């Protein structure tokens, strides 16, 4: 009787393939970190509505990062920081402007899929990787599991909430 399997305690684990992790952000800061330690490093940070330009500290893969953050929208902003190699620097790759405070991540087809854009029109976008199987994630917030075959429902949630 459930589409939303959960919510699950924040944890570190290797998610199975073909399942959306629907992560519910409670407060500002790091929402999750994920990597395979080879070619894929991503971390999403959450900035609350109506935040003028300010400097904030975030721990990413055990590294202190100081980012300047701006949020002029009435919605929350979820910024994806990405790098593709050990010696690389992190850069902003994607932005999700959402008033539902939900992000999503899926491992499928040899790629990592997330949501970005502005709700209720957010869409999925892919990141190529040569080692999907070794990708793990530390989720800092409670989360749900939806099968990829029910991605439509996941979409709706991310775009409209509960």
């Amino acid at each position, epitope marked *: 009787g459930s589409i939303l399997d959960g919510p699950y305690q924040p944890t*570190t684990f*290797k998610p199975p393939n073909d399942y959306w992790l629907l992560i519910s952000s409670n407060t500002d800061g790091v929402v999750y970190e994920s*990597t395979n*330690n080879s070619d894929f490093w991503t971390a999403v940070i959450a900035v609350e509505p109506h935040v003028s330009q300010t400097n904030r500290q975030y721990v990413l893969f055990g590294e202190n990062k100081q980012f300047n953050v701006e949020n002029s929208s009435d919605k929350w902003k979820f910024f994806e920081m990405f790098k593709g190699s050990s010696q690389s620097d992190f850069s902003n790759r994607r932005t999700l402007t959402s008033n539902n405070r939900l992000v999503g991540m899926l491992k499928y087809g040899g790629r990592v899929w997330t949501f970005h854009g502005e709700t209720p029109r957010a869409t999925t976008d892919s990141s190529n990787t040569a*080692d999907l199987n070794n990708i793990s994630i530390i989720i800092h917030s409670e989360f749900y599991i939806i099968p990829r075959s029910q991605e439509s429902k996941c979409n709706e949630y991310i775009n409209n909430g509960l």
Partner: single-chain antibody
Amino acid sequence: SQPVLTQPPSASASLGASVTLTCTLSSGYSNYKVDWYQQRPGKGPRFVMRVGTGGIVGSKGDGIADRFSVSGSGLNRSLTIKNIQEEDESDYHCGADHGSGDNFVRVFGGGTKLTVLQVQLQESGPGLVKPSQTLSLTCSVSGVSLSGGSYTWNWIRQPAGKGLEWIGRIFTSGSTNYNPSLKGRLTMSIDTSKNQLSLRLSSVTAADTAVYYCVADYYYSVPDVWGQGTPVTVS
């Protein structure tokens, strides 16, 4: 192994003074980060600090005193020790990652001998091995489950020349990266259920005489974790 790390063989310092050990990158790698390692007398290496051109990256290692700072500019990467104690007399090693995915390699400096005026890894081996035979090493891990999936496990040897040599790394799935300098003589395995890491090196020669170390690399932290190594002497 495109980048080259240059460390002076020896450095000297007096008690209570300051000294700066340096590691110089080859041209074209000004953005690269390097790890510093401290190998105390009668011990194997331990992690010290990671530094790029913007200072320290991540946390410093366990047991590293606040007298240890770290900096970088241009191709220079520096480990500075102030108010030097005699326990600071040690060998100091420079390491750096290069590449991603299939072409990954780890390069090391020659090492600098400074003279002063949780997760546990245990490596086991034969001790003595005859040439042309196959060297079989194991390493037991006790801090974590090898089926967790958030660790990369490296093997690093210290052969003739006294500088560290990265030989390979294995991931939880069993995927591997080997050093090309070893041909295909090196196979690395992971035993999920026995929590064990295993290594085979075919057709060994005097060039393979070395101390072999297993190094845990947690996905979400900077400091390494070393076993204390297994001596291997090729007949």
